[PDB]
Amino acid sequence: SGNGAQGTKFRISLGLPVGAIMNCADNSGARNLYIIAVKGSGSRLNRLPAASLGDMVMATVKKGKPELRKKVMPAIVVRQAKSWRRRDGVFLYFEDNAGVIANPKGEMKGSAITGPVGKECADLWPRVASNSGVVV
C-alpha cells in the first residue's frame, strides 16, 4: 500500500502477479494497467510479487491517452476476480480485475470510478471511497 494508507488490512488472497493486465476503472483516459511491482512485497527466490484488493502497485498504461503511456505510475487495485475469504466466513469475488491511477500519497488522478469497489480498498484509501459510487 505504501504511504497514505489509513489503517491496516487483513490478508487477502493474491491474484495479480507481476505481468497481469487489469482494467482501468477511473476516467483519467487510460484503458488498462500493466502491473510491474507491488508495494510492500517481500523477497523469495523465484517468487513473483503479487497484488490483491487494496494494494498499491506500480503500473504502466498500455492502452489509452498518449500522454499516459511510456511511464511508470502508482495504482490501486479496486476489484479482484480471484476469490478471497472475509473474516465473517464469506468467500467472494468480482467479475473482473480493475484499478485506478493514483499518486504516491494515494490521491486519485481522476474524479470518478465506474463499477463496484471492494470494501477493504475503500476503507484503506479515503480518496477512493469519495470517488466510488457503490461499495461491494
Partner: protein, 386 residues
C-alpha cells in the same frame, strides 16, 4: 564457489529424525511446574478425536476492525469420557535422573484395563493381578507399607488412569493406560488423594474449564514412504530433466566426501509425535446434557453430533471438549490434553468466548439442514412418509 542466490533452508532440523513414533500414544515429556499451595488436581486428560465443525461468535478485541462483529471459526471436538484411577507411582530424585520407586495398584480392575496386558486375550486364562489382589485379602498391611514408602521418599507423585473405551463408538475394546502427574499439595496429600480415588472416575470438567489454553499431544496422520518434493518442500526440477524431476539435483559438494545429514532425502512422512500449544477451549460439553450443540442465541434443542454422525467416527454420547483450530492427529486417535506450561496474557488468552451458533449440518456432503425438523419444514412430506 558460493551459491548464486541466497534462499532459506527447506525444513526444520529440530524435528529430526522423520521416523515412525514408537507408540500410537504420544508421550508427555513435560508437566506444569507444581505449586503445592493449591488443591490436588490432575495436569492432563485423555480423549479421542472425533472431527471438526464450525461456529459463529462475536469478536471482543478493541482496536480490531472486526471488533463487536461476528466471525466464523473452525473448531475440533474431542470425545472425553471420564477416566478411571487404578494406581499411583512415586519417583525419587537421583543424580542420574528421576527414578520410579514404588507402584501400588487398585484392588479391582475391569476387563478394559486387563486387555492392555494381553496380546491373545481370547485364549488366556486371565490370571493378571490375581495374586496381587490377595494383598488386599488381609487387612491391607502390604498396601499400607508401600503407600507409606511413597509418602516418605517420593518427590514426584503420578497416578495411573485408563480410558473407558467401551463408552465410545470405537471397536477397539482395549483401553489406553497412562501416567498423569498430580500438582498441588504435599506428597502425603497427593498419595491420600490417589488412594481415595481407586476404582473411581474423574470427569473432564474437574480438570479443564471454559476459556482455558491447553496443549495437544498426539501422533500425526501417517503417509508411508514419501519423496523429497512433498516430504521437505523442495523445488520441482524443470520438465526437461532426464531421470525424473521430483528430486534434489545436488546432494553435496565433492568435499566432504560424504552425504551430509542436513540434505533432504526421501523417507517416512507422517506418524510423528507432535506437541502444539495455545489451543483455547471453546466449550466443555456434558454427555447427559441434552442440547449439547445449543447456545443462548440459537435456543434449539440439538446435540453436538452432525446429521448422519461424524464421518468415520460416529455419535458423541459422552462429555466432550471443543477446541479452537486444528489438532495434530486424525479421527479415532487417542490424544492427550495438557495444561499450559506457562501463564499466557497476550490478550488472545483470558478473553471470554461466548458461542452464538454451532454448525450441525452433515459433513458427508454439502449438508444444508441443521436438524431433521428443519428438513421436514423445507421439503415437506415425501412419498416414503405417506
Amino acid at each position: 564457489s558460493h551459491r548464486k542466490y541466497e534462499a532459506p533452508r527447506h525444513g526444520h532440523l529440530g524435528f529430526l529424525p522423520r521416523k515412525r513414533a514408537a507408540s500410537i500414544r504420544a508421550r508427555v515429556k513435560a508437566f506444569p511446574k507444581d505449586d503445592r499451595s493449591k488443591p490436588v488436581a490432575l495436569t492432563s486428560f485423555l480423549g479421542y478425536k472425533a472431527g471438526m465443525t464450525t461456529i459463529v461468535r462475536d469478536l471482543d478485541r478493541p482496536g480490531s476492525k472486526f471488533h463487536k462483529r461476528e466471525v466464523v471459526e473452525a473448531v475440533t471436538v474431542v470425545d472425553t469420557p471420564p477416566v478411571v484411577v487404578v494406581g499411583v507411582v512415586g519417583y525419587v530424585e537421583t543424580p542420574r535422573g528421576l527414578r520410579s520407586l514404588t507402584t501400588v495398584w487398585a484392588e479391582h480392575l475391569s476387563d478394559e484395563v486387563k486387555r492392555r496386558f494381553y496380546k491373545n486375550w481370547y485364549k488366556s486364562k486371565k490370571k493378571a493381578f490375581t495374586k496381587y489382589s490377595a494383598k488386599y485379602a488381609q487387612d491391607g498391611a502390604g498396601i499400607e507399607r508401600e503407600l507409606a514408602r511413597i509418602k516418605k521418599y517420593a518427590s514426584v507423585v503420578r497416578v495411573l488412569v485408563h480410558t473407558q473405551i467401551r463408552k465410545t463408538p470405537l471397536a477397539q475394546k482395549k483401553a489406553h493406560l497412562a501416567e498423569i502427574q498430580l500438582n498441588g499439595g504435599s506428597i502425603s496429600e497427593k498419595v491420600d488423594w490417589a488412594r481415595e480415588h481407586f476404582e473411581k472416575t474423574v470427569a473432564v470438567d474437574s480438570v479443564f474449564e471454559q476459556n482455558e489454553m491447553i496443549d495437544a499431544i498426539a501422533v500425526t496422520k501417517g503417509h508411508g514412504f514419501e519423496g523429497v518434493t512433498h516430504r521437505w518442500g523442495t523445488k520441482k526440477l524443470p520438465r526437461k530433466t532426464h531421470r525424473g524431476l521430483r528430486k534434489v539435483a545436488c546432494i553435496g559438494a565433492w568435499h566432504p566426501a560424504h552425504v551430509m545429514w542436513s540434505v533432504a532425502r526421501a523417507g517416512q512422512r507422517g506418524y510423528h509425535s507432535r506437541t502444539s500449544i495455545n489451543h483455547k477451549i471453546y466449550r466443555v460439553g456434558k454427555g447427559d446434557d441434552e442440547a449439547n450443540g445449543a447456545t443462548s442465541f440459537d435456543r434449539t434443542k440439538k446435540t453436538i453430533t452432525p446429521m448422519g454422525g461424524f464421518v468415520h467416527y460416529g455419535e458423541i454420547k459422552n462429555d466432550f471438549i471443543m477446541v479452537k483450530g486444528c489438532i495434530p492427529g486424525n479421527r479415532k486417535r487417542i490424544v492427550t490434553l495438557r495444561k499450559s506450561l506457562y501463564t499466557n496474557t497476550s490478550r488472545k488468552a483470558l478473553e471470554e468466548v461466548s458461542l452464538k451458533w454451532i454448525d450441525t449440518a452433515s459433513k458427508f456432503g454439502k449438508g444444508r439442514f441443521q436438524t431433521p425438523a428443519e428438513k421436514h419444514a423445507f421439503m415437506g412430506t415425501l412419498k416414503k412418509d405417506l
